[PDB]
Amino acid sequence: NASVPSIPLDVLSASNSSSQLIVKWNPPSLPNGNLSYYIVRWQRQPQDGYLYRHNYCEKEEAEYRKVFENFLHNSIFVPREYPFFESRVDNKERTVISNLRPFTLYRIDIHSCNHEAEKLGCSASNFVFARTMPAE
Amino acid sequence: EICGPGIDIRNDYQQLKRLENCTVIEGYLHILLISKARSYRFPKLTVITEYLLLFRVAGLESLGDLFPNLTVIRGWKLFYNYALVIFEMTNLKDIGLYNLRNITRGAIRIEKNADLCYLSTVDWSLILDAVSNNYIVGNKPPKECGDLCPGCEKTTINNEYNYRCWTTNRCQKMCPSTCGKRACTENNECCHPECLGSCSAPDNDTACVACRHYYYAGVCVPACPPNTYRFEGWRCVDRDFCANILSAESSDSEGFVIHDGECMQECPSGFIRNGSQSMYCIPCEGPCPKNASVPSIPLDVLSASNSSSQLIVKWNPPSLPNGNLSYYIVRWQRQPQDGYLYRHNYCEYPFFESRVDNKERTVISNLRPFTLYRIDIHSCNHEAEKLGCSASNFVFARTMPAE
């Protein structure tokens, strides 16, 4: 049976420029199928709550497990508030995002699909946080 | 109802309704392959002898939904020495089994419950004995489950001390040292000593939820009355009851048999039925017809006192005998009563040495009553008299106090 890809591996990100971000990741541990594409999402995160207001100035277990397998072998299993910007990934586990708010924090979500995500759905996200370079 | 002689529940929760009238289950419970298309509650169930097994029960979020009052599992027989197994319970988030007061025999194994929280929020040492045998793997990562207890109560959980909870709304309920080894009712009212787990009234063997030893006619009892005999390991039945018991249908199927005061499906090995397959077993006399190195320290050296000025002591053969065991040589030393302590007003010791003949047991005499003693036992193989004797296996024990 086909399945949901693994989450992306080794999700890693940086900013090389103010208002710009670079992100790199690695292909999923188990594609379980041809990858189709990755989808990366990002959203402005608010700067942390409060903060603003305050003035800061021997073993045998395999024969055990077989017991659970033996009951299974009696039955088959047979498959038939700020806005997000978003972009799909065509190829690389790398993409670049621009016109970001300088020095703001963003969430980045990365999902890894496969050829069956049009039917199975795409994988859950592997995700990381990074900050853009401030507006020099 | 005494349900039985064995329960196998699979596929559908609509089949789970068999429990509506059950309160005791004779024999194991298996729960397999259930998938749902609801809440369920079975507070009538209170004690299971033997073990409970659940496997791939989709659609249950917490165990306190089904079996809140399930108070004792005896584990008289074990699944590979396990009395409870929970496997691949996708979606189970907590153990709200908050009346669970004892698991008598058996270890616990807990695998693949990837959403289970309240993992180590339960003091297993309160409810069951050799917790060191448990196996808890692949469940929701506690570092990321981030369990929580209200407040309730806490204990020295391994290297920690931490609050103990079944679920956010229910803790692992416990009894004070006024009951201690003995059970209690909710309000810390001590149960009857023949009782087990929670009680509907304190100190009454006729008001028990369960019995530690045996049950009969609404009475918790230590052993079967003379015309009553041990059955399974929890209740007594009369000579005629087992006389009604044809064993399980089998090529070797016969009536149950009574022996050593237990009524059992068949005689223990080395014993046979009297005469024409009689109700009682009898033993068969004979087979029934168809270089050195330094020894380890001794093992399991243990000792106690039954009298002032005396001690009794027992041990086990060493981990590595490294030879034929010859004998044991026992030493003992006075410890001081603990340092500091003495100075506040709250209102050089000799070794003895002696050499054992044969037993892992010996007696020591003329001690000061209530003084603490170190016993050092050195274990010397036939070449230890050249090699040097073993390091010690050791214990500290106290003489019974002088009144």
Residue numbers in the entry:
A (entry chain A): 577 to 633, 682 to 704, 744 to 799
B (entry chain B): 1 to 37, 41 to 154, 162 to 300, 577 to 633, 744 to 799
From the paper:
The human type 1 insulin-like growth factor receptor (IGF-1R) is a disulfide-linked homodimeric member of the receptor tyrosine kinase family (Ullrich et al., 1986, Lemmon and Schlessinger, 2010) that signals into Ras/ERK or PI3K/Akt pathways in response to activation by the insulin-like growth factors I and II (IGF-I and IGF-II) (Adams et al., 2000, Denley et al., 2005, Riedemann and Macaulay, 2006, Laviola et al., 2007, Tao et al., 2007). IGF-1R signaling is involved in normal human growth and development (Denley et al., 2005) and in maintenance of neuroplasticity (Dyer et al., 2016). Despite these advances, there is currently no three-dimensional (3D) structure of IGF-II bound to IGF-1R or to IR-A. To begin to address this shortcoming, we present here single-particle cryo-EM structures of IGF-II bound to the intact ectodomain of IGF-1R.
The leg regions of both the closed- and open-leg conformations are less well resolved than their corresponding head regions. The quality of the map corresponding to the open-leg structure is lower than that of the closed-leg structure, permitting only rigid-body positioning of domains into the map followed by limited real-space refinement. Secondary-structure elements within the density for the domains FnIII-3 and FnIII-3′ were not readily discerned, leading to preclusion of these domains from the open-leg atomic model. By contrast, the density of the (L1′-CR′) + αCT module is relatively well defined within the open-leg map, with the αCT helix being visible in an apo-like conformation on the surface of domain L1′ and with protrusions in the map being identifiable with the aromatic residues Tyr688 and Phe692. No interpretable density is apparent for domains IDα and IDα′ apart from the αCT segment of IDα. Nevertheless, the existence of the open-leg conformation for the IGF-II-bound ectodomain is unanticipated, as such a “wide” open-leg conformation has not been detected previously in the cryo-EM studies of insulin-bound holo-IR, insulin-bound zipper IR ectodomain, or IGF-I-bound holoIGF-1R. One possibility is that the leg conformation of structure is an artifact of the zipper attachment, which might limit the mobility of the IDα and IDα′ segments and lead—upon ligand binding—to their entrapment between domain L1′ and the respective domains FnIII-2 and FnIII-2′.
